[PDB]
């Protein structure tokens, strides 16, 4: 049996909060990126360092450790861009019209206009960001959603019952947080629905982002790291 299912709601929340990776910085040269080379260069380097934190974060997500190593790989390969993006969107909440990739790297849609197929994905990320903002998304809710993405995104490809039950546990945790915030039962299931529907857009943005990354890989423009190459080829 897994420890995850024996945790209380507050224990789950506290475990997720404690597992949170840090907000990393980009290179400290100013020059707001406009070229595809300088843009993707900074984003690749950043995402690369974020992936190392994401991996060690995933290990501290209750229930994730209990999976076989291969299942952990599959779920991470499937969800990594989703997880990066929901982080980006969360970070960018209180900066409307802007994407906070890093505290020293705030991009707007005007910088996406200089790269083919980017400004479309930028607009989607910005819309998701303002949506989170209008809903007053809380950090405790955010970490639940990010764990949900990790466990759910590649869960369809006898221990499948485990993830299913863990996902239910996180659902209970979300509801607990909303009840804790003083929401009514009707407000709770309406908010739960709204949050989870956004996961469909995050999914969509990830797949579109994956195409975009595949294009720049073919361009041979920005040096991809071996880790990023393996995470990318997993979707190929």
């Amino acid at each position: 049996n897994s420890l995850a299912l024996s945790l209380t709601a507050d224990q789950m929340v506290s475990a997720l909060l404690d597992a949170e990776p840090p907000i990393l910085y980009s290179e400290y040269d100013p020059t707001r990126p406009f070229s595809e080379a300088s843009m993707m260069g900074l984003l690749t380097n950043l995402a690369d360092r974020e992936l190392v934190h994401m991996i060690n974060w995933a290990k501290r997500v209750p229930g994730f450790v209990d999976l076989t190593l291969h299942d952990q790989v599959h779920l991470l390969e499937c969800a990594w861009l989703e997880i990066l993006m929901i982080g980006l969107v969360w970070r960018s909440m209180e900066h409307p019209g802007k994407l906070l990739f890093a505290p020293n790297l705030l991009l707007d849609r005007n910088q996406g206009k200089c790269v083919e197929g980017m400004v479309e994905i930028f607009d989607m990320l910005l819309a998701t960001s303002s949506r989170f903002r209008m809903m007053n998304l809380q950090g405790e809710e955010f970490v639940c959603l990010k764990s949900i993405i990790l466990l759910n995104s590649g869960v369809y490809t006898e221990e499948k019952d485990h993830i299913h039950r863990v996902l239910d546990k996180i659902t209970d945790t979300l509801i607990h947080l909303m009840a804790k915030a003083g929401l009514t039962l009707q407000q709770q299931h309406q908010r739960l629905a709204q949050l989870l529907l956004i996961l469909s857009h995050i999914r969509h943005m990830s797949n579109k982002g994956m195409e975009h990354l595949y294009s720049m890989k073919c361009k041979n423009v920005v040096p991809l790291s071996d880790l990023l190459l393996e995470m990318l080829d997993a979707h190929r």
Binding site: V52, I55, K59, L69, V73, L76, L227, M231
Partner: peptide
């Protein structure tokens, strides 16, 4: 073999 395989063990 994958890098991800390695990083998940450490």
């Amino acid at each position: 073999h994958k890098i991800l395989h390695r990083l998940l063990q450490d």
